[PDB]
Amino acid sequence: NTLNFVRFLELGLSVACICTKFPELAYVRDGVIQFEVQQPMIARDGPHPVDQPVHNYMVKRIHKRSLSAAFAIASEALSLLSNTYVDGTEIDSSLRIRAIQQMARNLRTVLDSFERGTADQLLGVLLEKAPPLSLLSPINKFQPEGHLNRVARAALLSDLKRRVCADMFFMTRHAREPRLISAYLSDMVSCTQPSVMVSRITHTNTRGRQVDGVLVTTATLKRQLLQGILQIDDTAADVPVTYGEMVLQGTNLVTALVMGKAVRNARVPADLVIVGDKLVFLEALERRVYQATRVAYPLIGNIDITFIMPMGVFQANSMDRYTRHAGDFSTVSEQDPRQFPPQGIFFYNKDGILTQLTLRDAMGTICHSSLLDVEATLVALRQQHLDRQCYFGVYVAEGTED
Amino acid sequence: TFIMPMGVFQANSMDRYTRHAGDFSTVSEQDPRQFPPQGIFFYNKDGIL
Amino acid sequence: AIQQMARNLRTVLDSFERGTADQLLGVLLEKAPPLSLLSPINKFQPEGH
Amino acid sequence: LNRVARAALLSDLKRRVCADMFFMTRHAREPRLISAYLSDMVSCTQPSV
């Protein structure tokens, strides 16, 4: 079989990043981007202070990563390629040609690995960079400006708790109705801020409308979103094919050397959907990338959920021990064996099997010597403020032979 | 503004009626609901009793 | 300094056109009676007295 | 796969064997879902030379 090579620019993931070449990247210490953002101001009267317009300055810095790929040749092939011990030139030429073909076939996939892994690194950094929608949306919708007081922040925190409890598996729960899915996809699209505008050539469709981003999914989610929910705009796109390189020369080179500082289409088969009022890509790269390799696909991440159940609670109040009807759970014995305090809990397994945690399982926790480790508690308690309390009930006296 | 009573006891013996016989039964020989009430239970902002 | 001066003064002059609408909204909120009272007053009271 | 993923896959295998056992004579009133699994059957075999 002949391996199918994947180019990074033909993928729809290239619309989420702007690429540029930099030969002197190993000699940077801290690259710096700069922002100057100004804000408008409104005028009022009455018992309000007059306001002045504010200017904000924000500075971000680069983060350096790398890529690695290996390439091996065996000892026999290395001996054949070094032209050492040549003999029988009709029978060793075939072995040398076989070694050359093996080396070329190895080097092809080794060179392809970097273009295959650029998309993986982009997916990893975008997955790290993304806050959850269930926390981003009510925060971006509820507070108008910020610097909230205690009450508004507390109400926002309660609403955040309720929203992250409710909308957690929003695709697999309300999968029967497409309208909720297409309603919250528009929320997810129009809940994030855009980026800067300065560019030369951008990813457009066949007609010429500029696309706004990428929406990467699993293949199951792609077919579920495409079967009835989102509408196809186009099946072709126009992508850039050149990076755009830059170097340092002239006065910038001598500034970097002395001072130590420096200053600065093709037709592709890819689907495009329309969400809200924005035209986005919908890539589900699982066959082009991550197929027949030894790595796991991202977007299959895990979550951790902790469960709590009480075990031996007896309702102390006599009012709370009530039954909904007279003969609910009757027995044969003269004493109903449910008024006794409970000693176990019953819950369901992963597979739906009934399981029981009786009180015998607490022997691993309460029958230890850590139950009698009161010394550090006493040492910490003795360094507090103590008043001279009467000692009638904590004092033992001695006889007097009376 | 919300208004609730606490210790209101229905004085008429006619007005102290149950919809069914064995609605809220207990194990005690005296039902601890014929006593006059001493409190009121409502719901919080988040739904907590 | 001159560029900062102009950039400050432009938003300062924008502020009055931005705040005239705010003052109009405030006085219209103050001037408006509720619909829940104004709707049956205009119907169930034809003339007055 | 490691031991844990293999065990979870085996449990899913048992549940899936119990689920779609007599599949055409069971859900004969849902023509969409039969096509939805026929597509899954067809797009599951690796091709040949």
Add this chain to the structure above:
Amino acid sequence: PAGIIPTGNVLSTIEVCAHRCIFDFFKQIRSDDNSLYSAQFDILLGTYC
């Protein structure tokens, strides 16, 4: 080791290591060091307003 041309010649060569408490930074290398060949810099990638 900036690599710029010398501004002026220096006379009276002596054992400079004897007077180390003068100046503010003193570095002595036997023949050559790996720290002499290092052209690390900082780059500004643009400003957005």
Add this chain to the structure above:
Amino acid sequence: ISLTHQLRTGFHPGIAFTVVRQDRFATEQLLYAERASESYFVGQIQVHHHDAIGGVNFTLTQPRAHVDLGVGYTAVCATAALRCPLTDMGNTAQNLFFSRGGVPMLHDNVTESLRRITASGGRLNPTEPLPIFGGLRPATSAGIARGQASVCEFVAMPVSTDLQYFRTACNPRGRASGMLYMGDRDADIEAIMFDHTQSDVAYTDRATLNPWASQKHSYGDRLYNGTYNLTGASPIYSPCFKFFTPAEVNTNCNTLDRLLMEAKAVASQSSTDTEYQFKRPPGSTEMTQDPCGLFQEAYPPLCSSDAAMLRTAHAGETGADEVHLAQYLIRDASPLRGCLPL
């Protein structure tokens, strides 16, 4: 020893327990990104000459860097679908005999007998050679059937406990606490978590539901807090370590941005290749989303004190009666309401 006798025979001592159990789930995600979301730089590829078993290995290294040129947030992710749970929701008690360092009993035979009875009726135990200068790894078993077993940690608390606390999303410490409440100073996290002069932040009519796992040096705090390190020799993950440890927090940022920084994909605190949910192996990078770890809450599942009332006789849904005589049934309040079939 008397507690061992009473718990083995069938007696009910005058205590009650709250159990905590952490579970993992495989989720399919969904991420959206804007146009100029990343500024991507590509370096120059360099080749390492490296010897091998018989020949040479060539390692190709290329450095690259990324800049997030967004004034706000330019990428939004959200979990969409639920796959198979990777863990098992079993009943595996945590054994505290893996931990060494506390004061021992005077007589060695009492401690050895206590470990011998504790080992009976449990899965995970220290090995019978008892390796001195070793990890005290539990004895390996045969194949696992339905996934990785998740340990349950037991917290003592009084019997006369308001059961309506556990019917909603509660806190296993007994007193609500955490990073989320600030706005006046920096030394307020300790005053929320440990100062019992003032009332609880959430349930504002009391100090704490239990006084045995909430104070500065109480039983649960002396046993499960990560600062004192009593269970440090245990190779098993404690599912309520995150609820008891004072997290290091900088208050230079506000509450909401610090919450969004906490809300990203944190590193895992368990093991996915072992069979007993051990502690985090060093040098393994697995990023898992952590709900209810930044809120310091824990969701109650469908549990009941009797199997009779847990399932009704109608060939369908389960029962929903709250209390019958002295038993109880807590309805499901977890996010897994319409999943995990019964």
Add this chain to the structure above:
Amino acid sequence: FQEAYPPLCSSDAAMLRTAHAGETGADEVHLAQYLIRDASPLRGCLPL
């Protein structure tokens, strides 16, 4: 799989069928008898 699926069985013929002219019974245990609901793949077949 080395498994065996339980069929619809009961320890008493009284609770095996209900008195509503339709579906069969669903009560699990009554006093000491039992009724095991069908977990086999033959749920919607084999008419009763």
